[PDB]
Amino acid sequence: MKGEPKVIERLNEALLLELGAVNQYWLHYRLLNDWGYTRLAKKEREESIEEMHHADKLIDRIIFLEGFPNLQTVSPRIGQNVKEVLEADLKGEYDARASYKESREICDKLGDYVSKQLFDELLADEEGHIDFLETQLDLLAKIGGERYGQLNAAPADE
Amino acid sequence: MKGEPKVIERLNEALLLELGAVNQYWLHYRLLNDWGYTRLAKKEREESIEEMHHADKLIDRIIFLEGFPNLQTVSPRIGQNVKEVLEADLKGEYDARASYKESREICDKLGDYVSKQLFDELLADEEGHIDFLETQLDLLAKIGGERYGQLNAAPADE
Amino acid sequence: MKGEPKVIERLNEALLLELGAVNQYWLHYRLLNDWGYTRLAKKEREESIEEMHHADKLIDRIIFLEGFPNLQTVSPRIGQNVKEVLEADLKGEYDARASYKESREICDKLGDYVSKQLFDELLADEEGHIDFLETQLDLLAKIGGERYGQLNAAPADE
Amino acid sequence: MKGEPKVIERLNEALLLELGAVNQYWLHYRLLNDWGYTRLAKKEREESIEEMHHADKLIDRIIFLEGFPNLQTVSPRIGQNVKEVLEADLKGEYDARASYKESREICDKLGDYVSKQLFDELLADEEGHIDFLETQLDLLAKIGGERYGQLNAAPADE
Amino acid sequence: MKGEPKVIERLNEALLLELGAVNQYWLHYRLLNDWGYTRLAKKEREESIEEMHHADKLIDRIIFLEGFPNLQTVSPRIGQNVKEVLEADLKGEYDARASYKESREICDKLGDYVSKQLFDELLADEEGHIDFLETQLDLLAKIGGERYGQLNAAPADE
Amino acid sequence: MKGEPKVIERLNEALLLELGAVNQYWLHYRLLNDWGYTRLAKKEREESIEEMHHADKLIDRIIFLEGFPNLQTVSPRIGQNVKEVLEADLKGEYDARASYKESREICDKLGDYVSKQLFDELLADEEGHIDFLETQLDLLAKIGGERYGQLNAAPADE
Amino acid sequence: MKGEPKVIERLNEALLLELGAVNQYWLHYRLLNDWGYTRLAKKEREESIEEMHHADKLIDRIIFLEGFPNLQTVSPRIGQNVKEVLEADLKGEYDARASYKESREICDKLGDYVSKQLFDELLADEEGHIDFLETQLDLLAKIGGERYGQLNAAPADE
Ligand code: HEM
Ligand code: HEM
Ligand code: HEM
Ligand SMILES: [Cl-]
Ligand SMILES: [Cl-]
Ligand SMILES: [Cl-]
Ligand SMILES: [Cl-]
Ligand SMILES: [Cl-]
Ligand SMILES: [Cl-]
Ligand SMILES: [Cl-]
Ligand SMILES: [Cl-]
Ligand SMILES: [Cl-]
Ligand SMILES: [Cl-]
Ligand SMILES: [Cl-]
Ligand SMILES: [Cl-]
Ligand SMILES: [Cl-]
Ligand SMILES: [Cl-]
Ligand SMILES: [Cl-]
Ligand SMILES: [Fe+2]
Ligand SMILES: [Fe+2]
Ligand SMILES: [Fe+2]
Ligand SMILES: [Fe+2]
Ligand SMILES: [Fe+2]
Ligand SMILES: [Fe+2]
Ligand SMILES: [Fe+2]
Ligand SMILES: [Fe+2]
Ligand SMILES: [Fe+2]
Ligand SMILES: [Fe+2]
Ligand SMILES: [Fe+2]
Ligand SMILES: [Fe+2]
Ligand SMILES: [Fe+2]
Ligand SMILES: [Fe+2]
Ligand SMILES: [Fe+2]
Ligand SMILES: [Fe+2]
Ligand SMILES: [Fe+2]
Ligand SMILES: [Fe+2]
Ligand SMILES: [Fe+2]
Ligand SMILES: [Fe+2]
Ligand SMILES: [Fe+2]
Ligand SMILES: [Fe+2]
Ligand SMILES: [Fe+2]
Ligand SMILES: [Fe+2]
Ligand SMILES: [Fe+2]
Ligand SMILES: [Fe+2]
Ligand SMILES: [Fe+2]
Ligand SMILES: [Fe+2]
Ligand SMILES: [Fe+2]
Ligand SMILES: [Fe+2]
Ligand SMILES: [Fe+2]
Ligand SMILES: [Fe+2]
Ligand SMILES: [Fe+2]
Ligand SMILES: [Fe+2]
Ligand SMILES: [Fe+2]
Ligand SMILES: [Mg+2]
Ligand SMILES: [Mg+2]
Ligand SMILES: [Mg+2]
Ligand SMILES: [Mg+2]
Ligand SMILES: [Mg+2]
Ligand SMILES: [Mg+2]
Ligand SMILES: [Mg+2]
Ligand SMILES: [Mg+2]
Ligand SMILES: [Mg+2]
């Protein structure tokens, strides 16, 4: 099903953002683990693997539409503390959300309703991630960064 | 354990090659699947996930040595048939093998024997992948590309 | 919920296409089985039963909207070999996809968003079938029709 | 039970042939595996281990008769393709069969009926191996060497 | 296998460091337990038992090389708080790491590659312990010593 | 419960003897194993681990009494045969028994009845070890050292 | 991966030693069994099968490096009693150890670190066998050859 070039371009823009998030969440997993925040690190690892599945679905759609998937990554936000790490994740999610809103509208306008549906599902997922991250940052604000870190660290015998 | 800058540079060069292989094997998985070679596609997916673990171990070592892991990827070899896909994988493995031979020698010379051991394990893994890919290309040569593809395709009801 | 006549007409047009596909996939199942291509035959049988479920959902929606479901079938594409059978299936899927794109737009324009959603789900399903059939025809092209048939035949003791 | 020197000599001649077959089947296992013919390779490995048991039984009989078992091997037939590998195996089996026919007659003439029985069992085993190998070479002749190789190769994900 | 005197001396130097660590980790287990930091205490006990296994492997190698294992301990670092306890452990690990780097090089130079391999395995283990302890001290720095202690204490009913 | 200095001194004297026995029994385990007396070696290993538990209980009591446990070891008796190994163990047990008899009397005189009870339990344990070792040496005397060694060695396939 | 001729030569020298040990341990198994030393015989059989696995790994590496594995055996040390059998095994292990030390150094010098690693693993294995055999010969020396034989014989009803 030879796809619209403009739809393939939007799918490739999403792929770049998703691969960027895979890399950023994985680096955050390893960084948080080295800092001792092993519980939050595990959540970042789980979120990275979810973004990997998103990237896979975009690659599949691009190939189905007879486009060329461009697997590349623009490297950084890398914080120096747990608040900055969460804020960097959140910035990325807002950026993706804005991209996918524009993309679903382009796909609708061009009559590719199945690609539209893919962007709608990504959009719902990103708002879920935003909801989660905003809550974590609200908790950090309320209890303080040191108790937030303690809450998200394991004792030494685990 | 603040590491030698030259060792961290070699670890980052390996990370770039490993991330490149993750991307290339994943694209090959999706491409082969779309062509109908579902059994070889599954093997490529399994090899991509192995390279992901390698990348993870390099990121961990870099952070332990107080370096900055550079997660970026130089994008392509993408073949148009199953022989070219296998040859592109094989080129990548030879390139990595040469890199890791040089890197283990640098780590030894600088007295970082644990980083040396990491490169030695990567080197053994790459020679295993080379062994596998050379055998697949030898089989393809012997039985022909069409029977090799048939062997590596599933029937329609699977 | 007395429905728009134009929506009921689009639902009945879909029902005709779905019932046509039920019949065509079932005939293909029996024809391929008689030719010895028992594995592909089983896939065609499975696809026929899926189209039966689609037809059922269209009948249910038509009755809910107080329309009369018209269960009739315009009889044929019946190939003489496995490539022609697959191509006939594929033509039917492209025809259905075009119908459902137009229908979802009509339902949206008339404010029947639940009927729109039914057509959107049918559209996604048809693109899935197109993806599958295009891959099978690509495999057949690459390995040849005789190896494709062999791959999709069972030995005599099964 | 101090044995006839001529019987011990025949048992040692058999031991040399059996050890030669152990080595040849094992080399064929590794060679076929490297070529990608993993299913035939497994059969060769199984046949090598059977010849190992034969060698063990000959060593045991030689020691019981108070002789000295001579464990040595005259090294090669090593083919360059699957037909030549099978033909080399078959030549070895015909050579062993002829040896064991002569040996059972010598043991009978000298009144060592239990050693005769050992050669009779080896002879039956060798005719079984000949039956198998002749059938494989007949199949290879009928379907061609490339389909025979394909039949005896595994897909990449196994 | 009568060993090089210089290798046996290096093995005995390692044994002294390992036995020192057994004693220091065990004292830390009992001290931390008395302070109420029962979770960190358990980790120290587990680390002491690991060092016991290391000491055992060194004794075995020394005896194999026909040397005399010298089981003695130079007694202390004993902190007055949890930060000082962790820092004392870490000092010991850095001291051992430096010893084992020098020792593996001596064994290599003298051609005792199996003793070299033992020191390489100890070296990898010590860098693992360093990684762990540096992370714990980083967490303590980030959340404060009182929350770090609380995290590593059990409630009264456990 | 700030303890009597004289009681803490007696507890530290016991700790030194117990740690000495840990080391001596462990060296005997490894030495006997290298000589081939694997069954007696296992018993020595089990006895070493029991002395480790004794040392742990002394460390705990010393800390409870607000003393400083002194973990150090005066290194040797190391025999050249199985009789000398057993005699060295036995000498150590008699030395400990005499120490603990004096210590329980000091603790009683000073009114530390719980420390007295600890020494009473150690004393009973040591008389048990003496009973065992005297019986082993009596058996060795009666059947001879070579049969005693044979009895306490495993066959080669274990 | 076309290998260095000098590395392939070292691998073939190892293969000859390993195949020699397979044969010698198997003959020792059968000889010891005929003498009644069934427990030691079983250990020799187990050691022969381990050497078979070593030979297999060398054949695999040689083929990977595009060399020709030479499966041949220089026939003998065959003792007349259990002490001589053990001493013959031990001589063979010392000979192999010396070969593998030289070979790992050659592979390192030529930059074949994976072949180096294979020789390092063989070297560790051989020192393990030396450790075992030296202990058995020490036990035999201490308890006498007749009790050593008795220890390694089964009663008649087993
Ligand atoms: C093109 C980029 C990538 C794709 C398409 C991708 C895809 C996937 C998928 C689909 C899985 C699920 C595995 C399963 O079925 O359980 C997975 C797992 C995983 N990914 Fe990736 N990924 C990508 C990049 C990365 C990167 C850059 C890393 C860096 C370390 C990584 C690390 C992992 C790990 C550790 C797993 C766990 C697999 C296991 O548990 O064995 N991935 N990936
Ligand atoms: C302060 C000195 C020591 C203390 C307090 C101590 C304490 C202990 C304790 C309580 C255990 C029981 C482990 C369990 O819960 O199963 C143990 C086990 C053990 N000990 Fe020690 N020990 C000491 C010295 C040594 C030494 C010098 C060695 C020399 C090799 C050693 C070797 C072992 C071994 C091998 C184990 C077995 C643990 C396992 O199976 O994983 N110990 N020790
Ligand atoms: C005197 C020559 C030989 C004798 C008497 C012999 C005997 C045997 C026997 C009786 C077994 C059966 C093991 C079992 O009980 O499952 C066996 C297994 C085996 N043999 Fe040999 N063999 C000989 C030569 C070789 C050679 C030259 C190789 C080359 C690689 C080899 C490779 C193997 C392997 C890999 C096994 C499998 C054992 C396992 O799965 O752990 N053998 N051999
Ligand atoms: Cl799709
Ligand atoms: Cl932080
Ligand atoms: Cl590490
Ligand atoms: Cl192709
Ligand atoms: Cl409905
Ligand atoms: Cl056909
Ligand atoms: Cl017999
Ligand atoms: Cl071939
Ligand atoms: Cl074919
Ligand atoms: Cl060792
Ligand atoms: Cl504290
Ligand atoms: Cl107490
Ligand atoms: Cl003795
Ligand atoms: Cl290899
Ligand atoms: Cl004997
Ligand atoms: Fe989740
Ligand atoms: Fe999640
Ligand atoms: Fe999620
Ligand atoms: Fe995403
Ligand atoms: Fe996201
Ligand atoms: Fe794998
Ligand atoms: Fe793999
Ligand atoms: Fe792999
Ligand atoms: Fe890799
Ligand atoms: Fe690789
Ligand atoms: Fe289905
Ligand atoms: Fe289906
Ligand atoms: Fe379907
Ligand atoms: Fe349909
Ligand atoms: Fe359809
Ligand atoms: Fe069989
Ligand atoms: Fe067989
Ligand atoms: Fe057979
Ligand atoms: Fe045979
Ligand atoms: Fe045969
Ligand atoms: Fe641990
Ligand atoms: Fe640990
Ligand atoms: Fe540990
Ligand atoms: Fe250690
Ligand atoms: Fe350590
Ligand atoms: Fe006990
Ligand atoms: Fe005991
Ligand atoms: Fe006891
Ligand atoms: Fe004691
Ligand atoms: Fe005792
Ligand atoms: Fe073993
Ligand atoms: Fe063994
Ligand atoms: Fe072994
Ligand atoms: Fe060996
Ligand atoms: Fe060996
Ligand atoms: Mg529209
Ligand atoms: Mg070196
Ligand atoms: Mg050096
Ligand atoms: Mg509207
Ligand atoms: Mg007659
Ligand atoms: Mg050297
Ligand atoms: Mg009293
Ligand atoms: Mg009183
Ligand atoms: Mg070098």
Coordinates of C-alpha atoms in Angstrom, one line a residue, chain F residues 20-118:
Chain F
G20 CA 42.6 -19.8 66.0
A21 CA 40.5 -23.0 65.8
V22 CA 38.5 -21.8 62.9
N23 CA 41.8 -21.2 61.0
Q24 CA 43.4 -24.5 62.1
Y25 CA 40.4 -26.6 61.3
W26 CA 40.0 -24.9 57.9
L27 CA 43.7 -25.5 57.0
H28 CA 43.3 -29.1 58.2
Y29 CA 40.3 -29.5 55.9
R30 CA 42.3 -28.3 52.9
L31 CA 45.4 -30.3 53.8
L32 CA 43.6 -33.5 54.4
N33 CA 41.7 -33.0 51.2
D34 CA 44.9 -32.7 49.3
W35 CA 46.2 -35.9 50.9
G36 CA 43.1 -37.8 49.8
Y37 CA 41.4 -38.1 53.2
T38 CA 38.2 -36.5 52.0
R39 CA 35.9 -37.9 54.6
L40 CA 37.9 -36.6 57.5
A41 CA 38.4 -33.4 55.7
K42 CA 34.7 -32.9 55.5
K43 CA 34.4 -33.4 59.3
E44 CA 37.1 -30.8 59.8
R45 CA 35.3 -28.3 57.6
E46 CA 32.1 -28.9 59.6
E47 CA 34.0 -28.4 62.9
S48 CA 35.6 -25.1 61.5
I49 CA 32.1 -23.8 60.7
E50 CA 31.0 -24.7 64.2
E51 CA 33.9 -22.7 65.7
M52 CA 32.8 -19.8 63.5
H53 CA 29.4 -19.7 65.2
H54 CA 31.2 -19.8 68.6
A55 CA 33.3 -16.8 67.6
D56 CA 30.2 -15.0 66.4
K57 CA 28.5 -15.5 69.8
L58 CA 31.6 -14.2 71.6
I59 CA 31.7 -11.1 69.4
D60 CA 28.0 -10.5 70.1
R61 CA 28.4 -10.7 73.9
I62 CA 31.5 -8.5 73.8
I63 CA 29.6 -5.8 71.9
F64 CA 26.6 -6.1 74.2
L65 CA 28.9 -5.5 77.2
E66 CA 30.3 -2.4 75.4
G67 CA 33.7 -3.9 74.9
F68 CA 35.9 -4.0 71.8
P69 CA 36.2 -7.5 70.1
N70 CA 39.7 -8.2 69.1
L71 CA 39.7 -10.4 66.0
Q72 CA 43.2 -11.6 65.7
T73 CA 44.9 -15.0 65.4
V74 CA 48.2 -16.4 66.7
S75 CA 49.2 -18.8 63.9
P76 CA 50.8 -22.2 64.7
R77 CA 49.9 -27.0 65.2
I78 CA 50.1 -28.3 61.6
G79 CA 50.9 -31.9 61.2
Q80 CA 52.5 -33.9 58.4
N81 CA 50.2 -36.9 58.8
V82 CA 46.6 -37.6 59.9
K83 CA 47.7 -38.6 63.5
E84 CA 49.5 -35.3 64.0
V85 CA 46.6 -33.3 62.6
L86 CA 44.2 -35.0 65.0
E87 CA 46.6 -34.5 67.9
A88 CA 47.0 -30.8 67.0
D89 CA 43.2 -30.4 67.1
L90 CA 43.1 -32.2 70.4
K91 CA 45.8 -30.0 72.0
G92 CA 43.8 -26.9 71.0
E93 CA 40.6 -28.3 72.6
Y94 CA 42.3 -29.0 75.9
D95 CA 43.7 -25.5 75.8
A96 CA 40.3 -24.0 75.2
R97 CA 38.7 -26.2 77.9
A98 CA 41.2 -25.0 80.5
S99 CA 40.6 -21.3 79.5
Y100 CA 36.8 -21.7 79.7
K101 CA 36.9 -23.4 83.1
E102 CA 38.9 -20.4 84.5
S103 CA 36.6 -17.9 82.7
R104 CA 33.3 -19.3 84.0
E105 CA 34.7 -19.1 87.5
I106 CA 35.7 -15.5 87.0
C107 CA 32.3 -14.5 85.6
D108 CA 30.6 -16.2 88.5
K109 CA 32.8 -14.4 91.0
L110 CA 32.0 -11.1 89.4
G111 CA 28.3 -11.7 89.2
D112 CA 28.0 -11.9 85.4
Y113 CA 25.9 -15.1 85.3
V114 CA 24.9 -14.8 81.7
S115 CA 28.5 -14.6 80.5
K116 CA 29.2 -17.5 82.9
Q117 CA 26.5 -19.5 81.1
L118 CA 28.1 -18.7 77.7

